């Protein structure tokens, strides 16, 4: 998916930030890689990417492998502000607002979490972008997808 560039500086062990605290909980033993680069010509539109929206704060932190399938009304105050952005109350939903010529510090930065997941089934997925050539009629050592 895509995030704001500044949130890259926010995701850190023991640090604050929107993604770390209110959007995704970092696993204590996370294994994987995050690959990101400027998606100015890919994740942004000339007409304005106003479709994307986010939530500033949530009552409960999202657990790992949990998807927030709820967008209920939020009342941050002790009185019924009825969604009016005012005293002690905030509007839960805000816009992302991505444009092609964004600065690097806040570009639509890519996020590719390749979370290695151990379910109750043997391995069936691989990423073998290393397959070399093959020679014949010579005593060599060979490997075919595990064998």
């Amino acid at each position: 998916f895509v995030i704001r560039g500044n949130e890259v500086s926010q995701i850190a062990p023991g640090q604050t930030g929107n993604i770390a605290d209110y959007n995704y909980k970092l696993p204590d033993d996370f294994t994987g890689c995050v690959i990101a680069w400027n998606s100015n010509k890919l994740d942004s539109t000339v007409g304005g990417n106003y479709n994307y929206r986010y939530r500033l704060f949530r009552k409960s932190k999202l657990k790992p492998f949990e998807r927030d399938i709820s967008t209920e009304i939020y009342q941050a105050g002790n009185k019924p502000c009825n969604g009016v952005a005012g005293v002690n109350c905030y509007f839960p939903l805000q816009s992302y607002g991505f444009r092609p010529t964004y600065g690097v510090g806040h570009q639509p930065y890519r996020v590719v979490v390749l979370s290695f997941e151990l379910l109750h089934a043997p391995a069936t997925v691989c990423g073998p972008k290393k397959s070399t050539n093959l020679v014949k009629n010579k005593c060599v050592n060979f490997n075919f997808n595990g064998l």
Binding site: R4, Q10, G86, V87, Q94, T101, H106
Partner: protein, 596 residues
């Protein structure tokens, strides 16, 4: 199908990139005032200066061409302003190394961790905000010694870094002709590589004896009077012999001496002359309510069109309930949202900055659909007219006093009147040598060939007066940190207001003899001058292609001869301000002046 069309498309792309980067600076501040986080400061250190690298591309096509002599005056001025020579001598690897060093040292300097509510006075002086509130304590000894100890412990270990920076510059700094960074915005001020309106070698070698010795007695009397006021009007808590406190200057430079009028009141607890009722009650700005209330009966009958109540929507708490550490980054996208990004504190420098920002955004509501080339004005005269004029017009307290919205508790004595007169007298030729000496100082220091044999004559006062660093003997050169201060990033040199020392005088002659309201010539009245500062908006859109203010050359007179009538016009006031104090010696300037 032609290279010209592709170049125009690339220029439009660059303009769009600049607009989107300004929108980024606005939106990041919006988000970080909508959320409790500070990490955006990191983006200030790395991303910002990175954009400068892109500017290099323009230089690659801006030097060899003889295109500097465009026939059109406005186009020629714009090209002179936006295509200065710059520092294009560095190679790609050298530029990368310099950028990495700059980023590392800026990160080290700007990440000062010691700024917290529990700290009595020692916070990060680089970032204003609450720092000017808790530090308002009578412990001047602590305020000085803790500050000097912190400066020592953060600067003594940096000496090898500054030495390597100096020796890296010195291999080619003798021919770089780089004096002030502010030219990044106003490169038309100084011309590099060829003679111009500035002081060349032939002009400088002559001005060091005629103008220097002509203005030396005036500067001597001025700073002698300043010293007398500082060691006599203020209590003698410390010996005048010791270094002067740098906290009196207010900001890091201290160029804006008028700030002394803001900080002339030692107290900060009891209410002052400001609209703070909403800040105490609702913790938000109250000037918008006054602006709304001062418009319902000021109609002109049949206006051409209305542009005063576009934003009729009612908004309460347009941001954070409690203000975090303030930082000046005021900028609004407009037409879909408007939020106040700048804070509000007790400083007239902030007032003048915010007035200019408000004028520029008022330009923006009309020029958001215009290219960046004509988005901002070229001459500083336009900014001066739409800038400090409004602040001076609104500085009159009669309008607020007559209504009587607040408690009738008001105090005014002879001291306030004398301070006002002194502040007015600080906006005349008297301020000129102080800034001219700083400019000449900054121009010579970046050469490396001036002999360093003598230091007591014209260098003993640099460490004692400007920085106030306490040393046994100020016989050193490696300590020149303020010459490379962080503001090089934002180019906040105040030379753009230089003409305010002269032009604003002439405007006074236009009114002080015409309106002649009740009151002698000693105190000229400027009341009800806001209409004069507002009537210019009626045709700014129409006069975009024919800027009349650019044509006249009234900014400068004639340096080739001495104008006798323009030198003794205000002699009775000048002599009164000169020989009023009894401690000023009359006649020849003695070689040894311990009290000067």
């Amino acid at each position: 199908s032609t290279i010209e069309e592709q170049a125009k498309t690339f220029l439009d792309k660059f303009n769009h990139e600049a607009e989107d980067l300004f929108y980024q600076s606005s939106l990041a501040s919006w988000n970080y005032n909508t959320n409790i986080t500070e990490e955006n400061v990191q983006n200030m250190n790395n991303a910002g200066d990175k954009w400068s690298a892109f500017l290099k591309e323009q230089s690659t096509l801006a030097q060899m061409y003889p295109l500097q002599e465009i026939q059109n005056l406005t186009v020629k001025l714009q090209l002179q302003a936006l295509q200065q020579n710059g520092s294009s001598v560095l190679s790609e690897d050298k530029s990368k190394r310099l950028n990495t060093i700059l980023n590392t040292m800026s990160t080290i300097y700007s990440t000062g961790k010691v700024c917290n509510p529990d700290n009595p006075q020692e916070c990060l002086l680089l970032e204003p905000g609450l720092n000017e509130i808790m530090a308002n304590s009578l412990d001047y000894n602590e305020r000085l010694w803790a500050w000097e100890s912190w400066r020592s412990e953060v600067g003594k270990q940096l000496r090898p870094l500054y030495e390597e920076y100096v020796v890296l510059k010195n291999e080619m700094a003798r021919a770089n002709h780089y004096e002030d960074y502010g030219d990044y915005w106003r490169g038309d001020y100084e011309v590099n590589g060829v003679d111009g309106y500035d002081y060349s070698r032939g002009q400088l070698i002559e001005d060091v004896e005629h103008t220097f010795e002509e203005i030396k007695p005036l500067y001597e009397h001025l700073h002698a009077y300043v010293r007398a006021k500082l060691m006599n009007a203020y209590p003698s808590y410390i010996s005048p012999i010791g270094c002067l406190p740098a906290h009196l200057l207010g900001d890091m430079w201290g160029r804006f001496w008028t700030n002394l009028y803001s900080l002339t009141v030692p107290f900060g607890q009891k209410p002052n002359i400001d609209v703070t009722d909403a800040m105490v009650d609702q913790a938000w700005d109250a000037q918008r309510i006054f602006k709304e209330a001062e418009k319902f009966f000021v109609s002109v009958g049949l206006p051409n069109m209305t542009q005063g109540f576009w934003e009729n929507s009612m908004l309460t708490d347009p941001g954070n309930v409690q203000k975090a550490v303030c930082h000046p980054t005021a900028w609004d996208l407009g037409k879909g949202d408007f939020r106040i990004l700048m804070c509000t504190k007790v400083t007239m420098d902030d007032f003048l900055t915010a007035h200019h920002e408000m004028g520029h955004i008022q330009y923006d509501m009309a020029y958001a659909a215009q290219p960046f080339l004509l988005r901002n004005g070229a001459n500083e005269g336009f900014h001066e007219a739409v800038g400090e004029i409004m602040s001076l017009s609104a500085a009159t307290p009669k309008h607020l006093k007559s209504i009587g919205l607040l408690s009738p508790d008001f105090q005014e004595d002879n001291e306030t009147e004398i301070n006002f007169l002194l502040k007015q007298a600080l906006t005349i030729v008297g301020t000129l040598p102080f800034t001219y000496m700083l400019e000449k100082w900054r121009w010579m220091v970046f050469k490396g060939e001036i002999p360093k044999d003598q230091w007591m004559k014209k260098w003993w006062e640099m460490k004692r007066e400007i920085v106030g660093v306490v040393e046994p003997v100020p016989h050193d050169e490696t300590y020149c940190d303020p010459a490379s201060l962080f503001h090089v990033s934002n180019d906040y040199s105040f030379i753009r207001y230089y003409t305010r020392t002269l032009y604003q005088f002439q405007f006074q002659e236009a009114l002080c003899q015409a309106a002649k309201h009740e009151g002698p010539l000693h105190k000229c009245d400027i009341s009800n001058s806001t209409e004069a500062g507002q009537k210019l908006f009626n045709m700014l859109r129409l006069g975009k292609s024919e800027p009349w203010t650019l044509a006249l050359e009234n900014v400068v007179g004639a340096k080739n001869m001495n104008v006798r009538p323009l030198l003794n016009y205000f002699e009775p006031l000048f002599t009164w301000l000169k020989d009023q104090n009894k401690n000023s010696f009359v006649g020849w300037s003695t070689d040894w002046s311990p009290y000067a």
